[PDB]
Structure 1
Amino acid sequence: HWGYGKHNGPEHWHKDFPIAKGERQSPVDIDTHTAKYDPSLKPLSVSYDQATSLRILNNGHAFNVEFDDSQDKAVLKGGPLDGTYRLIQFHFHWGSLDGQGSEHTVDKKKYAAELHLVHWNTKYGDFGKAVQQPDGLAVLGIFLKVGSAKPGLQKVVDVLDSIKTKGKSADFTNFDPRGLLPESLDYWTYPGSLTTPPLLECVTWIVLKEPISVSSEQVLKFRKLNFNGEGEPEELMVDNWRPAQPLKNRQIKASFK
């Protein structure tokens, strides 16, 4: 099946998921001098005070922190969005070295990792229906650079030992995702897709300009996870990122000048 190895990596995905060569694939390089400042872009409204985190899971591709999305508890509005989007989960993509790891790039610069907060449009009823629509999802992307430690990320780091291998999960309650946001909410936005199979083109991307800083010790613990299941040959979970895809007929807009 698909993965990030040499025999099942991104360059092979198109064989089982032809949309891999679509017209609005993600991620992309954000060229800052080509981006169009759009004053018609509203500020983002992130309402995470009632968020209810439930569990943390190693799915063999990354680790996800899942939330209760049975009601409007953690929602994203405003920005380039029409309607209310509910937070369902968040996860990261990272590298084997501090010089790579992010999916999106800025003027070709790669960050150490990238955080993805996934939301789905409530007008569609369930996540499964949302992914089949062009405005189905809204993913908030945040870059991570290596520097000072991020206190609000340490609770996640500490629990990684318990979900080392594929399929493992652990209760993960009372985590506040507000601790993962940078000061400013200035962003870039463009229409795109999911960055791993099924690669559906149902995403409105909102990438924050301001990265968050994490310590080398924190990223190091991400790199100790495994792609493999327990009892199988150890394969380190690193470089689970898809390289930039052609922009084609798309315009990246900026909420700031």
Structure 2
Amino acid sequence: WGYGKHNGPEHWHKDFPIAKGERQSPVDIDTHTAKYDPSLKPLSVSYDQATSLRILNNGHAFNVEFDDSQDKAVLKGGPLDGTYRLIQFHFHWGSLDGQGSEHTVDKKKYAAELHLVHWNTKYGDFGKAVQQPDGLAVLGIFLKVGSAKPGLQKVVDVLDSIKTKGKSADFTNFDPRGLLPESLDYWTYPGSLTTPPLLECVTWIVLKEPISVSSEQVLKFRKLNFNGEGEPEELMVDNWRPAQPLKNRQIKASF
């Protein structure tokens, strides 16, 4: 699978029939239809002990991986019951600044979207957690092109070293607090992984406030390659799934 005309999102259902399921992601967030939910408990992003390990080009994005062998960086509160551990983050982005996000807001596409992936510790490991409807919590943060994000530049500066599929580099001591906007106001809905295997195991938490990154920062994302070393060059751009039917779901606002 991939994002090309021959292997992209419109093909995924043949190998992953859940692609046409009842709780697929991403979705369009209609700001007028989302309802404030006063019952949402406060959201808790506890990243002060986060331990990053490595950055990897997996052929569809780059992932920054964390040590999740104890409760260091965790997400709690909001719509969540219990404790979700940070395991990785990655982005989705466009070939052009007018596209790249997976979620949309009143059909507005952002230049990119950050996904901070967490798993429910009650299931003991990530592989078990993805088999549960409440297994994962993904924090989604929109990127718009404007002012540079200083907390992103350490990621930007290592991308030259992982240009092609299967390349990795040590990425210790990275603080994911520097990727957050000021406000933690969010929307939330039940959904899925946005890449195969498209498992319906995600509580999505999408922040309303985007972060600003510079044109030069997102230009460097678009210099990555989908391909392996020594294969024909395919720029890693437009690695986003389009919005999926909402079906029988309600998007809740924290604000």
- Calculate the TM-score normalised by the size of structure 1: 0.99
1:19-62 deviation line (CA, Å, top 9, x unaligned):
00000000000000000100011121010000000000000000
Cα distance in 1 for partners of 2:231, 2:76 equals 43
Per the alignment, in what secondary structure is the counterpart of residue 97 of structure 2?
coil
Shift of 1:205: 0.1
1:158-212 CA-to-partner distances (Å, cap 9, x unmatched) read 0000000000000000000000000000000000000000000000000000000
Report the CA distance between 1:147 and its aligned residue.
0.1
Alpha-carbon distance between aligned partners in 2 of 1:44 and 1:214, rounded to the nearest angstrom: 24
- How far apart, in 2, do the equivalents of 1:9 and 1:52 lie? 33
Select between 93-102 and 41-50 the one with higher mean Cα deviation. 41-50
User: What residue number does 1:84 align with?
Assistant: 83
For 1:75-128, what per-residue CA distance to the aligned partner results, in whole angstroms no more than 9, with x for missing partners? Answer: 000000000000000000000000000000000000000000000000000000
Q: Percent identity?
A: 100
Aligned to 2:14, the other structure's residue is in SS state coil
Distance 2:227 2:42 in 1: 41
The CA distance in 2 between the partners of 1:157 and 1:198, in whole Å, is 28
Distance 2:103 2:46 in 1: 25
**Offset of residue 215 of structure 1:** 0.2
Q: Which residue of 2 aligns with 1:107?
A: 106
- Runs of at least 5 residues in structure 1 that lack an aligned partner in the other structure: none
Give a deviation string over 1:124-176, Cα, whole Å, max 9, x none: 00000000000000000000000000000000000000000000000000000
- Tell me the distance in 2 between the aligned counterparts of 1:41 and 1:54: 33
Q: Does 1:28 align with 2:47?
A: no
CA RMSD for the aligned pairs?
Answer: 0.3
**2: distance between equivalents of 1:108 and 1:165?**
32
**TM-score, normalisation: structure 2:** 1.00
CA distance in 1, matches of 2:43, 2:98: 29
Instruction: List alignment gaps of at least 5 residues for structure 2.
Output: none
Q: Distance in 2 between matches of 1:155 and 1:230?
A: 23
SS, match of residue 169 in structure 2: strand
The runs of at least 4 consecutive aligned structure 1 residues that moved more than 2 Å come to: none
Q: Distance in 2 between matches of 1:124 and 1:210?
A: 31
SS in 2 for 1:10: coil
**Following the alignment from structure 1 to structure 2, what is the Cα–Cα distance between the partners of residues 212 and 109?**
15
SS at match of 1:20: helix
SS at 1:220's partner residue? helix
Distance in 2, Cα, partners of 1:195 & 1:203: 10
CA distance in 2, matches of 1:105, 1:124: 31
Name the residue aligned to 1:183.
182
Distance 1:146 1:8 in 2: 29
The equivalent residue for 2:54 is 55
